[PDB]
Amino acid sequence: PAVRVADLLQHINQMKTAEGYGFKQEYESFFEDRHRVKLHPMLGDPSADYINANYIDGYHRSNHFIATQGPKPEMVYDFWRMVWQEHCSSIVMITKLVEVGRVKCSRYWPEDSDTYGDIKIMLVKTETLAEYVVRTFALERRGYSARHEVRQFHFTAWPEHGVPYHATGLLAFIRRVKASTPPDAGPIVIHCSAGTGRTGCYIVLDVMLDMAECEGVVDIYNCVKTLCSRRVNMIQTEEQYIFIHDAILEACL
Ligand SMILES: [Cl-]
Ligand SMILES: [Cl-]
C-alpha cells in the first residue's frame, strides 16, 4: 500500500523502531528475457553474444530506462549501436572509472574522437562540476546523413563504501538529468558497475520523485519489488534501501 507524502516521516520512523526491524524485514522480503533490448545481429561471428540490457518502466512512460552494465571493450560498439538505434540522448553513469584504486569501468567514450565499428563519436563539450560531469557527444554513422547528439551525465560522488551521507547532491543530479531529457527523447541508458545497486537506487528515486509530485504518495516497496523482476539492477544493501527513503523525504520538503 502506498504511503502518503504527509505520512512519510512517520512511516520512516516506524520502520526504524525495534532497531530498524521494519526496513530489515522489508528489504529481506525482496529475496525469495522478455524485457531485453533487441539489436539486430550484424555480420561478424555467428557465435558472438550481444550486449545485455533491459528496459525498465518509468512513472510517466514504459521503457523509460535501459539498464545495462558498463560495456566491456568487446561490447563498446554494441553499446553505441544501441544508443543510436534507440535514439537515446541521455546516458547516466554512476561510478568513477577507478574507485579506491580498483577499475570499476573501462572508458567507452573518446577523449577527442574515435570510430567504433561504423559509428564515429566526437566529444564536443565537457562540463565538469563538483559531483558530476556532463559530456556531450556527436555520433555519425556510415550511410546516415546527420549527427546524433548524446549527453552523458556521469555522477562521480557516490562513496565507494556505502550510500551518500546526504542525498542533496544526488537529488540535484537527478533533477539535472530530468530537466535535460525531453519527453521527446528515447530511453535513458543507465549503468554503474556490476553489483553496486546504484542504478537501481537512481531508477527508484527517478520514479518516486515523479509519483510524489503527481499523486502526493510514494510506493517505494512495490517500485523496488518490480525492479527485482526486471533485471540484475537490484538494490544491493539494506542501507541503500533506507537511503532511498531518506532521499525521497528530503525531496518532499
Ligand atoms: Cl543497428
Ligand atoms: Cl572517473
Residue numbers in the entry: 872 to 903, 926 to 1146
Report text from the authors:
PTPRU is a member of the R2B receptor family, which includes PTPRK, PTPRM and PTPRT, characterised by large extracellular domains that mediate homophilic interactions and tandem intracellular PTP domains. PTPRU possesses evolutionarily conserved sequence changes to key catalytic motifs including non-canonical WPD (WPE) and pTyr recognition loop sequences (GSRQ rather than KNRY), as well as a unique threonine in the PTP loop. Here, we demonstrate through biochemical and structural studies that PTPRU is unique amongst the receptor-linked protein tyrosine phosphatases (RPTPs) in possessing two pseudophosphatase domains. Despite lacking catalytic activity, PTPRU can recruit substrates of catalytically active paralogs supporting a model where PTPRU functions as a scaffold to compete for binding to protein substrates.
The overall fold of PTPRU-D1 closely resembles related phosphatase domains (RMSD of 1.0 Å2 over 237 Cα atoms with PTPRK). The most striking difference is the absence of an ordered pTyr recognition loop. The structure and sequence of this loop is well conserved across the PTPs, with the key tyrosine of the ‘KNRY’ motif creating an active site pocket deep enough to exclude pSer/Thr residues, whilst favourably stacking with the phenol ring of bound pTyr substrates. In the PTPRU crystal structure residues 904–925 encompassing the pTyr recognition loop region are disordered, resulting in almost complete loss of the pocket that would normally bind the pTyr substrate. The conformation of this loop is highly conserved in classical PTPs, but in PTPRU-D1 this loop is arranged such that the sidechain of T1089 is in close proximity to the active site cysteine (3.0 Å between T1089 OG1 and C1085 SG atoms, Fig. 2dii). The T1089 sidechain forms a hydrogen bond with the backbone amide of R1091 capping the adjacent helix. This new loop orientation blocks the catalytic cysteine and would directly interfere with pTyr binding. In PTP1B this renders the enzyme inactive but is reversible upon reduction and is proposed to be a protective intermediate during redox-regulated inhibition.
